[PDB]
Amino acid sequence: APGALPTYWPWLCAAAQVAALAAWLLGRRNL
């Protein structure tokens, strides 16, 4: 679907992984 102007994918892709890592890492927080 060209014509559009995508320019917010990088924060979203990071928001996805950051959600997975932050979820596991949240288990620690006891160092």
Side-chain angles (χ1 to χ4, degrees), residues 1-6:
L5 304 169

Side-chain angles (χ1 to χ4, degrees), residues 2-30:
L5 304 169
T7 319
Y8 49 83
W9 245 71
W11 86 261
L12 181 74
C13 281
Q17 188 176 170
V18 169
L21 209 183
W24 182 89
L25 174 139
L26 173 55
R28 298 192 321 186
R29 314 303 81 183
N30 63 137

